[PDB]
Design a protein around this ligand. Structure first.
Ligand SMILES: Nc1ncnc2c1ncn2[C@@H]1O[C@H](COP(=O)(O)OP(=O)(O)NP(=O)(O)O)[C@@H](O)[C@H]1O
Ligand SMILES: Nc1ncnc2c1ncn2[C@@H]1O[C@H](COP(=O)(O)OP(=O)(O)NP(=O)(O)O)[C@@H](O)[C@H]1O
Ligand SMILES: [Mg+2]
Ligand SMILES: [Mg+2]
Ligand SMILES: [Mg+2]
Ligand SMILES: [Mg+2]
Ligand SMILES: [Mg+2]
Ligand SMILES: [Mg+2]
Ligand SMILES: [Mg+2]
Ligand SMILES: [Mg+2]
Ligand SMILES: [Mg+2]
Ligand SMILES: [Mg+2]
Ligand SMILES: [Mg+2]
Lengths: 273, 274
């Protein structure tokens, strides 16, 4: 016998070990094991918490954001910060229009505005505007919260942190340039081993995704792209959107994506209550 | 004759000079001066965008956040990140209820959940949970977006960036400790010249506000406080919420708070479109 799915969930809730591989001689020993591992997890949470109080630090997600951001600035990217609110028009330019099922999966603030489910709308707008002021590439990036109505999963959050980098009019082939920037981010994130895959997408038809052990940590694309007309873009470009919680979760080997980011139940992998 | 209230607004929205003090011999002299200052402003905008493209950098608001954050960590504060969503219950435990004006500024996501108008509810929760693990002060801070419905004002945004620091069970008089850590933040922000004032608050009854030239950049409170029972807090505490865009705007001498914050119309003080 093994841990039940319910026991595995409670263990992952409190601990960041691996539990689904244990095998026991009978239910009695399985249950004794469950108590011992809950006790070990709680103790490890105590130790991490006490360690943070004695040796305070910036937040694990903030540290990752700073690590990647400084690497992108070094490559010539301007950091921008854009509103979390976006308009119905901005969504429509992504083809997220009012009669599509997807329209209802965004958090609406009123009849005209919603919480951004992605940074690309604002990034296209800012990048295009900056093109009015330079003849070279427009390189910008943002790191900020996005919001999506999601079903329960160990890798999905209603609020998650996107990194979106945008290189409009790059100095080379857009796809080769994109793979170069993906490499910069992944190395700066401490995750140099990854795979690139072509993945279907309603908004993009197909994306270039970054996967680690089959887990999506990025969707990317290159221009000239069919979305350019709606954004008044008329040049090649390289763009990529990473999920920072997912990167941090995989690197730190957190049992779930809810432990490394924004929370009032966890702090840097530790359960605090 | 002076610039009209509208002329000021327009000059401020493209430029970062100081126009409210200008005086003019007559309406003709005023009007000609409105155009030249528009041209001086547009030119400076362009130089700023061009300067940013040739010298790319972290965002000004981000640099200010990193400066204060590292200073607070150096004083023993743990950085925490909490969700932007908060429950109707959490708001109620802050006494943010139907009768309070702040309640009418709340952005609701559904009938049970809202965009946080402040970080305090989440900070109380995380700080009180950490008290179970230590016999000393619990020192935490968060920097993140808060949301409020606001009328047109050169120092209000619907989405602004709060810094909230929280010292529960401080070592010293909570009010004296509060003033010390206000000093740490203000100096880290490059704004060493400020004053402290007492102000009325519908949530805290009374706050200690930080002002620069009479402009509020922070509201702070101390415990024991009547909000403590609803947060299971049974000890003194020191708490302060800073408006980071207001700090950045005053230090950089931007004309309004919209120029240095989250925007698709401004970037680091410069207007990027018409
Ligand atoms: N709910 C979420 N929680 C955390 N990260 C997310 C979430 N949704 C998307 N991301 C991340 O954001 C990146 C860019 O967004 P996007 O490609 O549109 O997501 P996605 O394709 O819907 N991913 P998925 O829902 O797992 O199939 C993804 O590659 C993920 O790493
Ligand atoms: N709409 C806003 N835009 C930008 N900063 C804000 C906004 N509301 C509050 N702040 C800042 O956040 C701090 C803490 O919030 P709080 O004291 O509750 O605001 P407040 O009392 O309503 N200030 P004010 O609206 O100018 O009278 C304030 O001292 C401001 O520096
Ligand atoms: Mg497991
Ligand atoms: Mg670093
Ligand atoms: Mg995006
Ligand atoms: Mg999805
Ligand atoms: Mg996927
Ligand atoms: Mg994707
Ligand atoms: Mg107010
Ligand atoms: Mg606050
Ligand atoms: Mg202390
Ligand atoms: Mg005030
Ligand atoms: Mg106030």
């Amino acid at each position: 016998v093994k841990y039940t799915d319910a026991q595995i969930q409670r263990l992952r809730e409190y601990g960041n070990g691996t539990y689904e591989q244990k095998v026991f001689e009978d239910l009695a020993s399985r249950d004794a094991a469950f108590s011992k591992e809950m006790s070990v997890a709680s103790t490890d949470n105590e130790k991490k918490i006490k360690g943070m109080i004695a040796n305070p630090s910036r937040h694990g997600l903030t540290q990752l954001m700073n690590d990647i951001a400084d690497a992108l600035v070094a490559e010539g990217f301007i950091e921008v910060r854009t509103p979390i609110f976006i308009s119905k028009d901005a969504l429509a330019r992504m083809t997220i229009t009012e009669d599509k099922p997807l329209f209802k999966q965004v958090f609406w603030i009123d009849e005209k505005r919603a919480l951004r489910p992605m940074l690309a709308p604002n990034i296209f707008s800012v990048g295009r505007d900056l093109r009015d002021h330079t003849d070279g590439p427009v390189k910008i990036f943002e790191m900020g919260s996005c919001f999506r109505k999601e079903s329960h999963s160990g890798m999905h959050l209603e609020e998650f942190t996107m990194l979106n980098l945008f290189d409009m009019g790059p100095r080379g082939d857009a796809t080769e340039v994109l793979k170069n920037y993906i490499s910069v981010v992944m190395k700066a994130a401490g995750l140099p081993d990854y795979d690139l895959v072509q993945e279907e997408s309603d908004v993009f038809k197909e994306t270039i995704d970054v996967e680690i052990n089959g887990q999506e940590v990025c969707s990317a694309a290159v221009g000239p792209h069919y979305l350019d007309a709606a954004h008044d873009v008329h040049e090649p470009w390289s763009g990529a959107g990473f999920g920072l919680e997912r990167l941090l979760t995989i690197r730190e080997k957190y049992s779930t994506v809810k432990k490394g980011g924004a929370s009032i139940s966890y702090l840097n992998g530790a359960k605090i209550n």
